[PDB]
From a paper:
Dihydrofolate reductase (DHFR) is a key and essential enzyme in the folate pathway that converts dihydrofolate (DHF) to tetrahydrofolate (THF). This coenzyme is required for a variety of cellular processes, including the synthesis of purine involved in nucleic acid and amino-acid biosynthesis. As classified in E. coli DHFR, CauDHFR could also be designated to have two subdomains: the nucleotide subdomain, in which the NADPH sits, and the substrate-binding subdomain, which is predominantly formed by α-helix 1, α-helix 2 and β-sheet 1.
The structure of apo CauDHFR was determined by molecular replacement using the structure of CalDHFR as a model, while the structures of the CauDHFR–NADPH, CauDHFR–NADPH–PYR and CauDHFR–NADPH–CYG complexes were also solved by molecular replacement using the structure of apo CauDHFR as a model. Crystals of apo and holo CauDHFR have a single protomer in the asymmetric unit, while the ternary complexes CauDHFR–NADPH–PYR and CauDHFR–NADPH–CYG contained two protein molecules which are independent and do not form a quaternary structure, according to the PISA server. This could be caused by the conformational freedom imposed by the lack of cofactor. The main difference observed is movement of Leu25, with a change of 5 Å between the isopropyl functional groups. Minor movements are also seen in Met33, Thr57, Leu60 and Phe65.
Residue numbers in the entry: 2 to 203
The structure:
């Protein structure tokens, strides 16, 4: 995997709810912008991939899709590993798409891939945390500071193992994503959140 693989996710402290049934009980305005800047930022002449599940794809409004400036990869169990004329990859598994990219030297429309972001929620976050090809986690740590009755009843939890990841210094996050990042906590109505990066083992 010549490109770096990132798994980018917003978890809720300290329990780590990934979704409440499937909606995300927060509109974090500056989170959306962070996500756009991070996934689009590549070297000159390079491009990034965005990898997501069928259901995340359908949640994006027609307006904004395919996610512009990125290789868009959609994973569904029974996809047939097809590429449509717009360059969107319709694949059945992450391993299937890594194989196909590897045969083309990790290039998309003759551009080198730089970073691959798994964004895909639900489903594939927990299917893919376990894959050792994953180089790092980009975790938006979220804190609820509202009014009790506003507290999210989180349904699905990031199958993370505290033992496997070490948090990186902010400079390393900024180097990696290639952009200055607001540091410390970010307060947005009923929520506090901060951007973090984790890599594995020794």
């Amino acid at each position: 995997t010549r490109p770096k693989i990132s798994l980018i996710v917003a978890a809720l402290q300290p329990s780590m709810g990934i979704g409440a049934k499937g909606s995300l009980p927060w509109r974090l305005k500056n989170e959306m912008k962070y996500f756009k800047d991070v996934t689009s930022k590549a070297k000159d002449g390079h491009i990034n991939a965005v990898v997501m599940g069928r259901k995340t794809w359908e949640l994006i409004p027609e307006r904004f899709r395919p996610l512009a400036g990125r290789l868009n990869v959609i994973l569904s169990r029974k996809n047939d590993d097809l590429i449509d004329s717009n360059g969107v990859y319709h694949f059945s598994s992450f391993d299937s798409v890594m194989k196909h990219l590897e045969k083309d030297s990790f290039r998309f429309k003759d551009m080198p891939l730089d970073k691959i972001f798994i964004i895909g929620g639900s489903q594939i976050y927990n299917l893919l945390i376990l894959d050792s090809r994953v180089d790092n986690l980009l975790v938006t740590q979220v804190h609820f500071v509202g009014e009790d009755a506003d507290k999210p009843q989180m349904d699905t939890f990031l199958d993370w193992d505290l033992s496997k990841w070490k948090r990186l210094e902010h400079d390393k996050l900024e180097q990696y994503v290639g952009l200055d990042v607001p540091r410390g906590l970010n307060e947005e109505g009923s929520y506090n959140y901060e951007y973090t990066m984790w890599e594995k083992a020794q």
